[PDB]
Amino acid sequence: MTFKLIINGKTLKGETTTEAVDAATAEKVFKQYFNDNGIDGEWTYDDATKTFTITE
């Protein structure tokens, strides 16, 4: 299970992706990834393709 964090904002524009030991294991970590960036907006996890997208 590979997750991808996409930041949709003029302030910060980036994209990353990687695999982990487990879906939930990476889901709990990927949540803190952007947490450090302090990105304020609509943060949600796309259960569809396990993709994390944010909309400021």
Swiss-Prot record:
This is Immunoglobulin G-binding protein G. It comes from the Bacteria. It is found in: Secreted, Cell wall. It comes from Streptococcus sp. group G. The gene is spg. Disulfide bonds: none annotated. Sequence repeats lie at residues 2-56.
